[PDB]
């Protein structure tokens, strides 16, 4: 119900629309990260370098296990029992998600037993789907096991040690939420390759960005065979219906020799009959719509709604206190600007057009072929379109001004009762 053409009279410009995409259902997959590679039949070449790798790993794996145990439990195992202490709605969802992990403990145990002794870097079993990546196994099989025929065990061991120390350094930057992007680039690369068979196939470039922002959760550590079990919740993005999102910016408004502007949020939203603002700090912009983890709408002030729904008289205004608020804009094949602050010689530099004192902004359509604002001359566009009042709801956005006005009121009624 936004009236874009009417709003221009008071300097509010609304960008072209876009849709919104939200994720409500998640697909659960498990990612076992075995950190000790295997060398097939190398006569125990690399054993010494593996031991040092284990000592180095114990620094980052023993604290991680201890932190896991100290974590409280919202639900103790109908889903389960409530437990003692305080926990809010946002924590109950994570608690339920973790409870779902205990149901697949038996199946995960089976997969780990199967992959105990194997040489494959990536391997998946689905009865429920599991995926297991082994430290730097690809590099080993490709350039270390072959390497021990021409160089010997010494050079191969030195190369293995350098590789493993570099791998340890790359670790401790993701495990210092572990962030999905950190995991993906670490092992080999990609995100559509790890989850070969899944919905990731039907993902655009913007969709892949949203998944990389999701955080994974550690749900087990072994300390006997060095492994970390992670739970990944990939999203299913479904576009909502009858939803639009715009963008709003404002320009200077002139009242009696001064500068004002109409303060509005960064974005405006309209879903169904609900008209209100929307924050996109955690969302991702795309070419056709947004992607938001949760509904961003937040209720605006009533006057702000009446203003945005075409009723100009109810918009509020404030004082300009900086140079951030602009003074001219290209609306549609024309300009809307405050001709008092900025010059408005349109057709020829000598020619000038003055906005009358009563009016606030000047809309030029067609009317004159070329327009120059300050020193630059522009030509209008005819393929486009365009067309050619009291606010009295002023406000102040600084607490000191409010306090002084309040003190004035306090003093005024005392004068009244006296």
């Amino acid at each position: 119900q936004i009236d874009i053409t009417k709003l221009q009279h008071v300097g509010v410009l609304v960008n072209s629309p876009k849709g919104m995409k939200i994720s409500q259902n998640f697909e659960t997959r498990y990612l076992i990260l075995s950190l000790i590679p295997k060398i097939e039949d190398s006569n125990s070449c690399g054993d010494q370098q593996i031991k040092q790798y284990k000592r180095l790993l114990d620094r980052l794996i023993i604290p991680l296990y201890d932190g896991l145990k100290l974590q409280k439990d919202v639900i103790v195992t109908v889903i389960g029992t409530i437990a003692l202490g305080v926990a809010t709605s946002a924590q109950i969802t994570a608690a339920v998600a973790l409870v779902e992990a205990k149901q697949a403990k038996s199946d995960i145990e089976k997969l780990k037993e199967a992959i105990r002794d194997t040489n494959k870097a990536v391997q998946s079993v689905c009865s429920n789907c599991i995926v297991a990546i082994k430290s730097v196994q690809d590099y080993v099989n490709k350039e270390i096991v072959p390497s021990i025929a021409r160089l010997g065990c010494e050079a191969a061991g030195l190369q293995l040690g350098i590789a493993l120390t570099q791998h340890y350094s790359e670790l401790t930057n993701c495990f210092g939420g572990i962030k999905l992007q950190c995991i993906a680039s670490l092992y080999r690369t990609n995100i559509t390759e790890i989850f070969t068979t899944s919905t990731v196939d039907k993902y655009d470039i913007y969709d892949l960005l949203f998944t990389e922002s999701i955080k994974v959760r550690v749900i087990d550590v072994d300390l006997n065979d060095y492994s970390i079990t992670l739970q990944v919740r990939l999203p299913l993005l479904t576009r909502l219906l009858n939803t639009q999102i715009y963008k709003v910016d404002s320009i200077s408004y002139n009242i009696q020799n001064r500068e004002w502007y109409i303060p509005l949020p960064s974005h405006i939203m309209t879903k169904g009959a609900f008209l209100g603002g929307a924050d996109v700090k955690e969302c991702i912009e795309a070419f056709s719509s947004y992607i938001c983890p949760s509904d961003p709408g937040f209720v605006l002030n009533h006057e702000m709604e009446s203003c945005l729904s075409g009723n100009i008289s109810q918009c509020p205004r404030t004082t300009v206190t900086s140079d951030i608020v602009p003074r001219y804009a290209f609306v549609n094949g024309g300009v809307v600007a405050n001709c008092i602050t900025t010059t408005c010689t349109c057709n020829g530099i000598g020619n000038r057009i003055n906005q009358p004192p009563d009016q606030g902004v000047k809309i030029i359509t067609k009317e004159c072929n070329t327009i120059g604002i300050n020193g630059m001359l522009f030509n209008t566009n005819k393929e486009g379109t365009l067309a050619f009042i009291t606010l009295n709801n002023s406000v102040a956005l600084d607490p000191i001004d409010i306090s002084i006005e309040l003190n004035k009121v306090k003093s005024d009624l005392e004068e009244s009762k006296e």
Partner: antibody, heavy 116, light 105 residues
């Protein structure tokens, strides 16, 4: 910790032979065994090697001529030769290769050898 | 590519003296060596099978130590019938190599 002899004898140039050294008395299925040559009145030398998995490795001078195979189930290691030449008159040894670790369980053994 | 050479090729000695036998590696073979005693008519034996460890049954007079490229094994006192040939092999690569030999006498 015992190794046997077999096949030591005289053959005509261009013949073919099958030397088998049989082992018993340790865990044979977790070690790499290799052959070693000693020309009479000359320094020692290497012939070939076989790992647990039958990958196989050979000395250049005998490449493409000899074959090495091992029987893990029966604890036996066999060698066959073809296109024999005059230079290959020596004493042949079947040996065990040390692991690349310092564990005290490793011993090291040396076959008695055939005088072919 | 790895090569081994040892000096002295020939030695003179007498019972009770001390003898030092070197073995220089062309490249880095590491702590992967072994010293064999070869006597005419007998199959070679193993003396020090990792450059440090003494094989069971070997006499204590054989002391061996070293690392990197240079290695060494030294005898404290001789036995008249222990003047045999001695070898320094390398098992760094699946493909072994030997030295020349040393007639201790």
């Amino acid at each position: 910790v015992q190794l046997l002899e077999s096949g030591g004898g005289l053959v005509r140039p261009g013949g073919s032979l099958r030397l088998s050294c049989a082992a018993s008395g340790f865990t044979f299925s977790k070690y790499v065994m290799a052959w070693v040559r000693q020309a009479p009145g000359k320094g020692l030398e290497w012939v070939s090697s076989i790992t647990s998995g039958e990958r196989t490795f050979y000395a250049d001078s005998v490449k493409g001529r000899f074959t090495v195979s091992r029987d893990n189930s029966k604890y036996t290691l066999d060698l066959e030769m073809s296109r024999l030449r005059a230079e290959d008159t020596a004493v042949y040894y079947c040996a065990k290769m040390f692991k690349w670790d310092y564990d005290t369980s490793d011993f090291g053994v040396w076959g008695q050898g055939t005088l072919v | 590519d790895f090569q081994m050479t040892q000096s002295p090729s020939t030695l003179s000695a007498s019972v009770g003296d001390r003898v030092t036998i070197t073995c220089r590696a062309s490249q880095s073979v590491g702590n992967w060596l072994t010293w064999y005693q070869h006597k005419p008519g007998k199959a070679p034996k193993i003396l020090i099978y990792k450059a440090s460890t003494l094989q069971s049954g070997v006499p204590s007079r054989f002391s061996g130590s070293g690392s990197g490229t240079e290695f060494t094994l030294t005898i404290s006192s001789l036995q008249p019938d222990d003047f045999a040939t001695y070898y320094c092999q390398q098992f760094n690569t699946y493909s072994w190599t030997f030295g020349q030999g040393t007639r201790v006498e």
